[PDB]
Design a protein around this ligand. Structure first.
Ligand SMILES: CO[C@@H]1O[C@H](CO)[C@@H](O[C@@H]2O[C@H](CO)[C@H](O)[C@H](O)[C@H]2O)[C@H](O)[C@H]1NC(C)=O
Length: 139
């Protein structure tokens, strides 16, 4: 399936198999969680003209970040559209990396893709670890 502006997707960690999930505990924290077709596990993509924004299908908040980009920066739901660069992974072209634009920081399921439900999604410097790679497909 092709990723296209206006469409809504789930985003699955290649290492863990859990998906990017807007925590039901606080409707703010971004975690890895097993997929149950929740709307808090579905993200509406928009191409702005220069980057992607990801809108929570349940809350209407956007996938964004907790502070300035760094190793360990938490992802959180934010009010305003937050722009991402999204590229195919170089080794596995069916998967993707999601970067803060013009940085080397990409989404990373913490604990090296810890499968535990509630594992935070964070930024980390880009490297080959598969917990930084994600499939994007229909809910
Ligand atoms: C009423 O308590 C909340 O119930 C929700 C439904 O079971 C639950 O939502 C899930 O949260 C997890 C993360 O903890 C994940 O986001 C799932 O996709 C959600 O369905 C809340 O966690 C419950 N707890 C609290 C404290 O609200």
């Amino acid at each position: 399936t092709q990723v296209s502006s206006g469409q809504t997707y789930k985003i699955t960690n290649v290492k863990a198999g859990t998906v990017i999930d807007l925590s039901g505990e606080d409707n703010k924290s971004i975690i890895g969680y097993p997929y149950h077709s929740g709307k808090n596990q579905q993200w509406t993509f928009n191409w702005t003209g220069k980057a992607w924004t990801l809108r929570s299908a349940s809350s209407g908040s956007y996938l964004g970040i907790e502070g300035t980009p760094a190793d360990g920066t938490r992802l959180v739901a934010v009010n305003d559209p937050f722009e991402w660069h999204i590229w195919r992974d170089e080794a596995n072209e069916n998967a993707f990396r999601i970067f803060v634009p013009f940085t080397n920081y990409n989404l990373d399921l913490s604990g090296y893709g810890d499968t535990t439900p509630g594992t935070p999604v964070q930024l980390w410097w880009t490297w080959e670890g598969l917990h930084q790679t994600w499939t994007i497909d229909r809910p």
